[PDB]
Structure formats: C-alpha cells, structure tokens
Amino acid sequence: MYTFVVRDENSSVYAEVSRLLLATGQWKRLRKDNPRFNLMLGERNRLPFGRLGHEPGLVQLVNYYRGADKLCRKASLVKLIKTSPELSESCTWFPESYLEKPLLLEPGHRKFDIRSWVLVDHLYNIYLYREGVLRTSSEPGNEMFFEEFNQYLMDALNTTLENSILLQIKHIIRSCLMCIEPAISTKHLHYQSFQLFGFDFMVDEELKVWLIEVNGAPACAQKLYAELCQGIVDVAISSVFPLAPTSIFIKLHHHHHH
Amino acid sequence: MRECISIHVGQAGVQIGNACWELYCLEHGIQPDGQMPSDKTIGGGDDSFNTFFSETGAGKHVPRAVFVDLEPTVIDEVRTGTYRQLFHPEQLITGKEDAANNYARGHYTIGKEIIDLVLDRIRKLADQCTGLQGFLVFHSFGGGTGSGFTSLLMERLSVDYGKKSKLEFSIYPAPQVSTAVVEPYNSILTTHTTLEHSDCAFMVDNEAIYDICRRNLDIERPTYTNLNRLISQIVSSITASLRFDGALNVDLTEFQTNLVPYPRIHFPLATYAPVISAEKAYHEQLSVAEITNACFEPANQMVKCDPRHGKYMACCLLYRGDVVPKDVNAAIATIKTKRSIQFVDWCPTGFKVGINYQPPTVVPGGDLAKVQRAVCMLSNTTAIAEAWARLDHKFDLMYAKRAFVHWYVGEGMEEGEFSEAREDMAALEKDYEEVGV
Amino acid sequence: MEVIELNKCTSGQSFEVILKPPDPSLEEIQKKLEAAEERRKYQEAELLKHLAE
Amino acid sequence: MREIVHIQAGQCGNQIGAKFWEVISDEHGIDPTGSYHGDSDLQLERINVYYNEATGNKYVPRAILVDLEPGTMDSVRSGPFGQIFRPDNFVFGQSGAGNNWAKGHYTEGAELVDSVLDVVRKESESCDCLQGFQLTHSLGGGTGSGMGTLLISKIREEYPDRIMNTFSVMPSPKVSDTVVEPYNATLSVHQLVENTDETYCIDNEALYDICFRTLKLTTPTYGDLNHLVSATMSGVTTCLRFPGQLNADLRKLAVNMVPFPRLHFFMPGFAPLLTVPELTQQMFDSKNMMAACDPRHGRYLTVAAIFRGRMSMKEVDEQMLNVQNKNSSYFVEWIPNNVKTAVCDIPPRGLKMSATFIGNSTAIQELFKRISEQFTAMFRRKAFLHWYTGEGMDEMEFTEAESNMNDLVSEYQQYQDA
Numbered sequence A: 001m002y003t004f005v006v007r008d009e010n011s012s013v014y015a016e017v018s019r020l021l022l023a024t025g026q027w028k029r030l031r032k033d034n035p036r037f038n039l040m041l042g043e044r045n046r047l048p049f050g051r052l053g054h055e056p057g058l059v060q061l062v063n064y065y066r067g068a069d070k071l072c073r074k075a076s077l078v079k080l081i082k083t084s085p086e087l088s089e090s091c092t093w094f095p096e097s098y099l100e101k102p103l104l105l106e107p108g109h110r111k112f113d114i115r116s117w118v119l120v121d122h123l124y125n126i127y128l129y130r131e132g133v134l135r136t137s138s139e140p141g142n143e144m145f146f147e148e149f150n151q152y153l154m155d156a157l158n159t160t161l162e163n164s165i166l167l168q169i170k171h172i173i174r175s176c177l178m179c180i181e182p183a184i185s186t187k188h189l190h191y192q193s194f195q196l197f198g199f200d201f202m203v204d205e206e207l208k209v210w211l212i213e214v215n216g217a218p219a220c221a222q223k224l225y226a227e228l229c230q231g232i233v234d235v236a237i238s239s240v241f242p243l244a245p246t247s248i249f250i251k252l253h254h255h256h257h258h
Numbered sequence B: 001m002r003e004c005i006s007i008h009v010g011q012a013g014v015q016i017g018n019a020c021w022e023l024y025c026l027e028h029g030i031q032p033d034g035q036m037p038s039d040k041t042i043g044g045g046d047d048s049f050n051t052f053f054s055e056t057g058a059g060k061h062v063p064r065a066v067f068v069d070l071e072p073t074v075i076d077e078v079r080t081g082t083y084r085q086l087f088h089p090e091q092l093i094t095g096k097e098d099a100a101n102n103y104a105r106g107h108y109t110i111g112k113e114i115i116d117l118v119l120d121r122i123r124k125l126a127d128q129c130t131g132l133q134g135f136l137v138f139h140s141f142g143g144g145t146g147s148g149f150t151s152l153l154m155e156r157l158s159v160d161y162g163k164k165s166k167l168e169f170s171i172y173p174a175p176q177v178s179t180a181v182v183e184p185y186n187s188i189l190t191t192h193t194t195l196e197h198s199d200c201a202f203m204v205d206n207e208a209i210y211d212i213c214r215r216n217l218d219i220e221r222p223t224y225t226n227l228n229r230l231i232s233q234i235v236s237s238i239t240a241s242l243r244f245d246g247a248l249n250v251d252l253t254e255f256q257t258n259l260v261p262y263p264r265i266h267f268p269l270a271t272y273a274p275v276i277s278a279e280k281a282y283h284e285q286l287s288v289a290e291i292t293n294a295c296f297e298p299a300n301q302m303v304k305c306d307p308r309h310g311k312y313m314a315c316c317l318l319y320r321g322d323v324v325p326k327d328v329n330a331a332i333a334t335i336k337t338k339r340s341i342q343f344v345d346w347c348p349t350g351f352k353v354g355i356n357y358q359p360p361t362v363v364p365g366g367d368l369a370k371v372q373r374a375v376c377m378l379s380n381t382t383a384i385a386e387a388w389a390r391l392d393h394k395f396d397l398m399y400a401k402r403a404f405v406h407w408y409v410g411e412g413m414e415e416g417e418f419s420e421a422r423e424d425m426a427a428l429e430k431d432y433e434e435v436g437v
Numbered sequence C: 001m002e003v004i005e006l007n008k009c010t011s012g013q014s015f016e017v018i019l020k021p022p023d024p025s026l027e028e029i030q031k032k033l034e035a036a037e038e039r040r041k042y043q044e045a046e047l048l049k050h051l052a053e
Numbered sequence D: 001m002r003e004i005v006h007i008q009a010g011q012c013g014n015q016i017g018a019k020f021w022e023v024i025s026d027e028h029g030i031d032p033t034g035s036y037h038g039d040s041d042l043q044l045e046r047i048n049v050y051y052n053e054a055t056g057n058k059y060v061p062r063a064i065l066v067d068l069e070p071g072t073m074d075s076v077r078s079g080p081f082g083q084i085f086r087p088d089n090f091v092f093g094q095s096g097a098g099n100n101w102a103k104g105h106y107t108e109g110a111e112l113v114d115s116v117l118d119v120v121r122k123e124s125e126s127c128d129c130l131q132g133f134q135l136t137h138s139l140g141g142g143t144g145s146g147m148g149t150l151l152i153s154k155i156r157e158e159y160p161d162r163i164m165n166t167f168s169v170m171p172s173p174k175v176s177d178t179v180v181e182p183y184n185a186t187l188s189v190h191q192l193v194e195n196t197d198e199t200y201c202i203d204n205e206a207l208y209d210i211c212f213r214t215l216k217l218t219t220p221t222y223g224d225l226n227h228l229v230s231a232t233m234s235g236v237t238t239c240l241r242f243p244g245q246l247n248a249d250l251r252k253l254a255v256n257m258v259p260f261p262r263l264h265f266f267m268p269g270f271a272p273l274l275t276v277p278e279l280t281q282q283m284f285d286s287k288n289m290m291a292a293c294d295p296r297h298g299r300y301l302t303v304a305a306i307f308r309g310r311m312s313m314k315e316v317d318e319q320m321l322n323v324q325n326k327n328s329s330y331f332v333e334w335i336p337n338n339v340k341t342a343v344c345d346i347p348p349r350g351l352k353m354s355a356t357f358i359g360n361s362t363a364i365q366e367l368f369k370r371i372s373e374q375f376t377a378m379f380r381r382k383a384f385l386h387w388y389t390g391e392g393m394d395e396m397e398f399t400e401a402e403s404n405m406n407d408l409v410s411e412y413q414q415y416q417d418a
C-alpha cells in the first residue's frame, strides 16, 4: 500500500492526480504533514526539499525538480540562455532579452500563443504530451486544438503542424531541459523528482517558433485533465511505484553523432 | 613539532576513538605493545607522528588521548582489548552512572561530579607537551554524555587553554541506529552551548555512513563496528597531515584558516572515495579521474545534502596513494565542465590539494578492500545546513508539546535553555541562508 | 587554471589550483552549575516535604 | 546503574514473582540450588543485574518477598525454586489484609513495613550502583495493592533519585475475588500515577480472554494467567538482563518511553502464544495485548519492541518499519521515530524466536475508565465503604482518588487529539 501527501490544494492538475490514486484502491492519502509518505504532491513555494529521502524504509518521490525555477523565472531564464554556453548567445528561438509580425489565423485576422505540456520523470526522460492548445485573440474558448490547427495549416499554407512548428518546439523543449539537467537531475540523489512543465510559444509569419516563458506549475485544458493526469501517474508515479497503448507522450530523445 | 591531544567522550567517541588508534598504529607501524621498530630515536623525538604519540624510555609509543565516559562498560573494553598495553590507566576515565540519553544529566548533574578530574588527567598530558596545538574532541550529538558533558568540557577547555585550537568530530543522529527519541533535543542543546568554543567541526551523519556500508560494502545490517571503521578512515585522512610530513593543514590553526571564513559556519562537509568491499572477488582499481569525481556525488558524502543548491566557501582535496598533480588538475579540469560547482562571489573558486603517497591502510580482516589511491574532500558548502533544518524540525515537533522536557528540567535545566538553543539554531540556519542566498 | 605554492617532500606533495578569482569565566561556569544544583535540591526538598505531609 | 532490587507483595504479587524468577533463572542457566550450569556466557554477562553472588559461585536473587499472611509465601518456599531465595528476605505477618486496601496501606501494613525496608536497605547498601526497584503485585487485593503502594512511597522517600518500576495486575469482574476490587484499584492507581516512573499494566481481563479465545483453554486457572505473565515479564526485562544498546537500564527506558511524567502506564504484548513477518504482525494486534484496550482507539506516544532468537536483523527492521509506514495514523506525528527496536540472540524457553511489545498508547485510558465505572457504581451509594471507614479512612480520600484518575483519563484523551 503506497502512501502519499498533498501540500498544494490549488493545483488543478494534481488534485485530479490525487483522485486517481485513491481510485486505484492501492494508494491512501496521509495528512499533509505526515513524514512517512512515498509521494509528495508538494507546495508551490518553499518546498522543503531538505527533508526528503531521509525516511528509512521508504522510497520517496516528489512532483517538483529542485532548481527548475531557473527555467520558470523570466529573469532567470533570460540569464540562463546567455550565460549558458550550450544555449549560447546564439539560439534563433529566443527574443532579445516584442513580435511586431506574428502569424495570423483566418477568418478573424487573429494572433495566439501555443501551450505544450511536458513531463520529465525521475530518469529524466523528456515526455511531450501529444495534445497542446492555442490561446487566441478573437480580435483583429478561445481554445484551438491540434487536429483542427493542423487541418488549417494543410489548407491555408499547404503544410502540417509537425513540419512547420512541432519540430522546432521539440527542439526548444529538448534544448532548455537538457541544458539544466546537470543542476537538477535526481539520478543518484536520496529522493527522486518528476515535474509537469508548460511551455508557451509564438509563431511569426515566416512560421518560425519562438519561446515565450516556461511555467512549472501549469494547469491543463479542461477536457484533457483526464487523459494527461492518467499519463502523469502512468509514467511518472507508477514507474517508481508499480501497481499489481499507444502512449500519449512523445519521448523527446535525439543523439546525433559528431 | 607541536602536540595534539585527543579526547573521546561517551560511547560513540570512545568506540570511534578506539578504531582511529587501531588504524594510526597500523599506519605508523606501531605494535599493540607499543613498540615501534622503525623509530630510531628511542624514548624521544620530534617527528611528525610525535604530535599524536609520546615515547617512554622502554621505547613505547603512547597515544596522547583521554577516554571519558560516565559509565565503564565501553571503556572497560579498551582496558582489556587488543590495545590495552597501548594506553595508561590514567588516560581511561569512567564514572558509575551514565547520562541516560539526557543532555541536562550529562552537563549539569553528573558533569559537575567528574569535570575537574578530567581536566586534570588532560592537564597531565598538556604538561608533557612542548608546544600543544590543541584538542580533537570525538563524541555524539545524541548521547547524554556525548552531548551534555562534552559541551561542559568544551566551555572549560576554552578557559584552561584559551589560546589552543579545538576541532570536533561529531556523530549526527540517525534513527536507523539511534538509541533515543530525544536525540534532537540533545543535538541542539550541545550545538548551542559548544558553538563559540569549537574552531572547526566535522559532522558525520550515521544515516550516510549506514547506507554507504550497505551500498558499497554489501553489508545487510551494519553494526557500529562497520560504521566505525569507515569513519576511522575518513578521520585518518583528515588528521594525516598532522601525523605525516606534508605542507597542507600542518597544524590545527590551518584547518580554521583554509576551511572557515566565518567562525559560526565551521562545519565542513566531508566526502570520501573509493569505498570498496573486501569480500569483492574481482575489482578494477579506480583512477584519479573517477575518485575525484565521486567527491561530488551526494551518495559518498558524510552528510546527505545537495551542494548544487548552495555555494562553496572553500574546498580542499586530500589524496592518499598513487597520485600526482597533473592527474588532479586534469581531473578537476573535466569535473568543472560537468558539474554545478558554484562558489560565493566573494571567494576564489579554487582547490587546496594535498597528496600523501602512502595508500590507505586497512585493518586485517576488515570489510574495506585495499586501494591504490583514495581521496577525502573537505568543502565548506552552505548545503550542509539542510542537516540543521531536518534536526530543527524534529526539535520543533516535540518541543511544541513540551514532550520529554520534564526529564531535563528535573535535572536542573530550564525550559528557557530549550528556546535559547533553538533561537541560536534559527540564527545559524539564517547565516547559512545569507552566505548561500 | 593556475597551480601555485607547490611543495614536495619524500612522502607526497601539496599545492593549490585556482579556477577563477572573485568566553565565560571559570566562576561564570561554576555558578550556572550550582544554580542548577540548587534547583535540583529544591525540587527534592518539595518532594520529601510532600511525602512528609 | 547496574543492580535492580526486586520486591513482590501479596498473593498475586508473590505468585507471578515466583514464576518470573523460575523463568529467568532458567534462561541464565541457574538451577534451584543457585548453581550456574550454562553453555553460553551472555547468561553471566549481566547476571549481576538481578542476582547477587554468594559463597561458592552461587547466584542469589536480589528479591524481597512480602505478605501480611504466611500462606502464599510458604507455598513459594516449597515450590521448585523455593530454596533459591535468601531465607532472610522472607518478610511476613500473620494477620493478612482481608482484601482491604486500607488494611494494607494504613493499619496491618504499617506495622510490617519497617522490617521490609530493613531488608530493602541491606540489599541496596551492597549495590555497586543501584538503578532502582521493581515491584510485582495486584491492585485489587489488600497487601499487594495497599501495602505495595505504601512500600513504594517509603522507598521513594529513602531513594528519591532511583527508578521505581512496577508490574501491576489490574482487576476484572471476569476474574474476580471480591466486589471491592474497584475501590482497591482506584486507590492504588492514584499512588502509582505519582510514585512510579514506569508501570506495566497487566489486565486480568486481557489475560483471561487470551487463555480462552486463543489458547483454547475452556477453564483457565490463575496458573494459566501466570504463564502469560511470567513470559511477558521475561520479554520486557530482556534488555536489562542481556547485552544491548536500547533501553539497557531502567532510566534510559523511562526517558525513551515517558514523554509526560504522569503518562507512564504501558501496554505489554507477546508472541507467539513464526517468520519475522508473523512475529511483527502478532505482537501488534489487540489479541496479543496484556491490557484489554484497543490500540486502534488511541494513538501511540512511544513503543519498544524486542525480538529474541536467531533471525535476520534486516528483516526485523523491514518489518518494523513497514508496520509504522502502513499505520502511521496510530503513531503521533509530534514524536519523530517513537518506535525503537532491540534484538537479543537468546530466546526464551522452548521457543526458537519471540517478540515482546511495550506500548505507551492513549488507548490505555479505556482500562482506567472501566475501573472508574465500576468504582463509581458502588461509591455513589457508598456501598461496602464500612470496611474502609472502619480502618480510619474517610470518604474524602475516595473522592480524591476518583478525581485524580478521572484526570489521568482526561490527559490521555487530550494527547490523543493533539
């Protein structure tokens, strides 16, 4: 019988994850400050990473990466992309730190920003949820999902979402995450980590993707909470705490020799 | 040649003490009966090992050590053990009735009874020192003697030897081997009282040592005997510079200078490698590159914490065995580009290195395998403050209900000292927070 | 990466490599001890008194 | 902190004390003549904790046998190990105590108590370092209950800084001798709350139910109940009788087990009545508790487990860590790591391995409520009081005892909600 603790009640996502764990009759919820837990759905600020992995007889796992805020903080991210040699001053996909020439959907002559959900498990596998969403201005949901935004591209521009956009997105995600892996990985650490991230993008008229910001405590599109959350417990929680397809995630792996 | 006297307090200190001296003797080629063939200056000398051993006309090398415990059963083992001949009876002091895992009992009640005797038996060692450096105090945080009597001793050493340096080897409490529920209390109480009187303290968390034994020595359920031998090795590396010809950390003052910018932040993290099973049929010897790399694995530290999420104020590398600078530099070259090694912006991001060509010595019939090179890394990282955090939380939980507090007040202490000691620890956790920011 | 202050002897060597530049008195203790001692003696007195009652 | 002085008082007290000595004597390789015939030497390594050394390498129990009538003590002096006790350490009157606490505490007992303290004294004076006293007795009679708590008070006076530990058999209607047992028990509990550091609450209810439902004995005798008791007493004292690091003496035990001075009444448990997993499940279930309380009706403040025999230390620790992790609700959150485990290589007689449980649970309040309920049912109507007022006692004394125990129950409850 695996035990877990909830320390963030405002979490749209993990509140749903909690429901699923109870719904498997093989996970029981302890009081928020009981230390004898397997899993911690910890708080948003001042998560006491210092008191994890110190309970003998318990494999302990938490749903946040200590240090990942460097990515999730406007000022930190910007600082990270410059100083970080691997990212370089170079890197086409990041604004100098506004887009005067964004892409536009028709009818409506409207702009938008893309949101992709990424899961990084304890082994630092990078998983990209096959479903994203667009937050559009209905002025010259508003929620636009891939199937139809893919269909639109095949019509308006004679191309696909995969080719014109999703290749760069996967590149940006892989670049930002594998850049800070040495600072946050829990590979030989006394506790384990996983975390759901939200990346926000822009697409200029030339169909070039641009990174906006990264959120470490993202919500989800209403109808997707179900599918995504099941995936979170599937590949991030059940993987460390096994129970007694067609994955919804694209495993971002790429090893070019040179 | 300046002498160094060791003081082993309580069961942990005594039992760990007995292991270090067994090791030292093996390392300096000193036999149980105390004879030392390779030593040619009979009944005298100012060699490097004379800082830890004195000589008698009969050619016996006597540890400059005092064992203290408020109960005799543990020290009685020394009196009758393999090295009974080594020590002189005056060096082994025992009381009748222990502190019952109670700081207040060890400090106030029973401490007052036995303190003066101890200071005398120590004075007798000091009188035989031409240039005493200071003391190395070994003890636990959790024991009543180890916590309560030690801090009294430390207070009084600072009086009777105000100029001398005092180093600490402290066993930080771990439930997997802890013997008491109140060890959090004792830990804070002894830290608060000893803080100003300790120049440099090396914390060894039994949790970390326990797992290293399981993980690397394939020991199902480690005993103190296992724990103490790994601990003895780490201690040996740290004191080797004082016992062998060298130029790094040659005296107790140098430890302070090289590892302790701020007085209150005097708890250097130690990391040791490699630790290999003796019952290991086939082993492939590790290089400078590999062992220097392990020094940055939390799984090899004496305290489980994450330096990646803190800043360094100093870092010091002590090698033993087949090593030369080029290899160390080249190993450091690589490591820097593959790790998150961040110093406080107001310090040089460098490494003070020391190599003793003599590879680590292991006890015959021990769990540790012989290696050709090893390394202990002392680094003052703010990350070790995680250990104060864990402790301060456990303390807060119990004290909130005043659980067990009556046992301390009953011995003459006062609830006040509980909250004073806790506030000071709150300061410590903040001082680390600033430096570390 | 500058190696400095290299020292060599028969049993090893040391050096430094830099990567990048930037008390209570005797009386004072006896009183606390005696202060606690009396508090003990007092509590014992209260007990023996209570028993006497 | 080496020698313990053992005192046994009254019929019950002497009957369980006699078995305790027979049992541990066996474990330590001592025979009825006092001669050692053991194969191991762990048997002798701490033999001084309970035995003195007499002439001719004879070990004599540091035991003092008390009673206001001769019968039961004459019975002991005839039993198997009857010749092992120092003849001088038999102290008895002729009048008896008539199952009356007042007679044991105030009248018949007062007359006998000094001669007992004379023996207690000579045993103490030849102690290299006495740690404290352990008393065995019932709380429902008169000698063990009334004189026993009288002894405790005097002993504390003459040894204020030593540890007082008792094995106290609580009365139950299911195994009753007289109707005034709730009076005697209530009066004693009040003495115990003030004058002991640790008390093992051995409930005659629990002991009977265990003999009937589990051991399947259709009609159990006091002898049967005393088989369980002597076995439990063996287990809970193992850490004091053999080389160990946990609760190795009475004071360290008290420091680990008693977070608040008044809450020192323990719930013992034993198993079996066999893999490490099976030991660890049984020792923890109600049906192995020697106090008729449901631990699931309260929370644990502290717990002391002891495993005996050759077994895997790794598995013990796995099993102990797992019981807590899987019921972490019943252990209080404000005392980190309140469960301590010990292991001893020497198992009891006839068993390959066993486990002994000692729990400071807040469910223990149920035992005090039961007594309080019985006590009140009679006191309300002042029934059977004349037996006590005839010895000089006043109602006021009863009203206090009732109140002081009600408090005790209120304390256990407040810490169950914290």
Ligand SMILES: Nc1nc2c(ncn2[C@@H]2O[C@H](COP(=O)(O)OP(=O)(O)OP(=O)(O)O)[C@@H](O)[C@H]2O)c(=O)[nH]1
Binding pocket: B009, B010, B011, B012, B013, B015, B016, B069, B070, B098, B099, B100, B101, B102, B106, B139, B140, B141, B142, B143, B144, B145, B146, B147, B171, B172, B173, B174, B177, B178, B179, B180, B183, B206, B224, B225, B227, B228, B231
């Ligand atoms: N590493 C190691 N830890 C020990 C050893 N002995 C005891 N400890 C630890 O020390 C703590 C208990 O303190 P002790 O040193 O045993 O007790 P003490 O200092 O003798 O004080 P009292 O016995 O209470 O008078 C526990 O946390 C133990 O895990 C040892 O030999 N090696």
Ligand SMILES: Nc1nc2c(ncn2[C@@H]2O[C@H](COP(=O)(O)OP(=O)(O)O)[C@@H](O)[C@H]2O)c(=O)[nH]1
Binding pocket: D009, D010, D011, D012, D013, D015, D016, D097, D098, D099, D100, D138, D139, D140, D141, D142, D143, D144, D145, D169, D170, D171, D172, D175, D176, D177, D181, D204, D207, D222, D223, D225, D226, D229
């Ligand atoms: N378990 C057990 N309980 C006993 C025994 N003898 C008496 N009792 C209980 O103790 C109470 C009677 O007290 P007892 O010791 O006989 O009277 P005392 O000699 O005046 O102290 C009742 O609750 C009995 O059930 C015994 O041998 N074993």
Ligand SMILES: [Ca+2]
Binding pocket: B039, B040, B041, B042, B044, B045, B046, B047, B050, B055
């Ligand atoms: Ca010499």
Ligand SMILES: [Ca+2]
Binding pocket: D095, D111
């Ligand atoms: Ca008379």
Ligand SMILES: [Cl-]
Binding pocket: B160, B161, B162, B163, B164
């Ligand atoms: Cl001086």
Ligand SMILES: [Mg+2]
Binding pocket: none
């Ligand atoms: Mg924003």
Ligand SMILES: [Mg+2]
Binding pocket: B010, B011, B071, B098, B143
């Ligand atoms: Mg001890």
Ligand SMILES: [Mg+2]
Binding pocket: D011, D141, D177
């Ligand atoms: Mg009777």
